[PDB]
Write an enzyme that holds these catalytic residues in place. Structure first.
Site, mmCIF file in Angstrom:
data_model
loop_
_atom_site.group_PDB
_atom_site.id
_atom_site.type_symbol
_atom_site.label_atom_id
_atom_site.label_comp_id
_atom_site.label_asym_id
_atom_site.label_seq_id
_atom_site.Cartn_x
_atom_site.Cartn_y
_atom_site.Cartn_z
ATOM 1 N N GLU A 20 0.996 -1.382 -0.096
ATOM 2 C CA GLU A 20 0.085 0.001 -0.240
ATOM 3 C C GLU A 20 0.897 1.175 -0.109
ATOM 4 O OE1 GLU A 20 -4.079 -0.924 2.245
ATOM 5 O OE2 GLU A 20 -2.332 -0.601 3.911
ATOM 6 N N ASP A 58 1.300 -4.843 8.829
ATOM 7 C CA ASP A 58 1.029 -3.317 9.656
ATOM 8 C C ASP A 58 1.979 -2.962 10.020
ATOM 9 O OD1 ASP A 58 -1.740 -3.403 11.743
ATOM 10 O OD2 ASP A 58 -0.223 -3.464 13.017
ATOM 11 N N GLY A 59 1.841 -1.614 9.890
ATOM 12 C CA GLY A 59 3.109 -0.971 10.870
ATOM 13 C C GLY A 59 3.737 0.055 9.280
ATOM 14 N N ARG A 229 24.182 -5.732 20.095
ATOM 15 C CA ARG A 229 24.824 -5.978 21.145
ATOM 16 C C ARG A 229 24.043 -5.399 21.932
ATOM 17 N NH1 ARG A 229 29.034 -2.920 22.312
ATOM 18 N NH2 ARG A 229 27.760 -3.128 24.591
#
Length: 240
Positions: A20, A58-59, A229
């Site tokens: 999208e 999503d996001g 790390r």
């Protein structure tokens, strides 16, 4: 209980793909919120594509926000095909001029016939229903989404509705519905460097990792070796 933990990764922004486009204003609200908090609350849920590429499910706005801030990598949760399915958002707006405007501008094969095939798109007004059948469209059926959505979206205030039979059957209202895309279809769109109109697709996802609160300072660490790390340690402190 470390199923989630095992699937949290730090993926380079240049290897994640969107199916999208993003709303330009939603981006600046998300980006502003993340900066004010100095952490990204939720990890960007992605699905693994071939050749080490990933697709956001999503996001989108979280992804584009971190990308705009110059983050080389972003925190994602790799989702599996078993965990999620695909659906669609129904669009409810008021009936108006755009229906005729859409008609003459593109002259799509709208029909009242209720066929053995499933409607590719549906238009509900009163106790009437008009459909598009992908056969009638044939080719150029990839693009019709953009044409139908763009008609009402702009001159109307769109309201997203899920398929829970939650609509109010207003005498004046219209309800747009779109046949869900299979995973294969969406993959092809991404492969062609293309997009679909936002606000239609809907990923129902299970086993989500939420409220991870990854600090921005970590995602801004230029040094790669050190970043891994603190990241690996970050996933140690927070069990999954």
């Amino acid at each position: 209980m470390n199923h989630i933990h095992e699937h949290l990764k730090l993926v380079p922004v240049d290897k994640i793909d969107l199916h999208e486009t993003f709303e330009p204003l939603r981006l600046e609200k998300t980006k502003s919120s993340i900066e004010a908090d100095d952490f990204i609350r939720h990890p960007i849920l992605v699905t693994a594509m071939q050749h080490g590429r990933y697709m956001v499910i999503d996001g989108v706005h979280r992804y584009t926000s971190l990308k705009a801030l110059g983050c080389k990598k972003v925190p994602v949760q790799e989702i599996h095909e078993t965990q999620y399915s695909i659906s669609t958002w129904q669009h409810k707006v008021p009936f108006g001029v755009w229906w005729e405007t859409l008609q003459q501008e593109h002259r799509l094969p709208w029909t009242t016939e209720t066929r053995q095939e499933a409607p590719f798109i549906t238009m509900c007004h009163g106790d009437t229903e008009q459909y598009l059948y992908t056969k009638d469209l044939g080719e150029a059926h990839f693009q019709v989404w953009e044409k139908v959505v763009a008609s009402y979206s702009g001159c109307c205030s769109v309201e997203r509705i899920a398929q829970g039979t939650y609509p109010c059957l207003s005498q004046q209202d219209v309800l747009m519905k779109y046949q869900p895309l299979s995973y294969k279809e969406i993959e092809a769109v991404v492969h062609k460097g293309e997009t679909v109109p936002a606000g239609v697709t809907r990923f129902n996802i299970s086993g989500r990792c939420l409220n991870l609160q990854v600090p921005l300072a970590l995602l801004k660490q230029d040094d790669d070796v050190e970043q891994l790390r603190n990241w690996k340690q970050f996933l140690a402190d927070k069990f999954a």
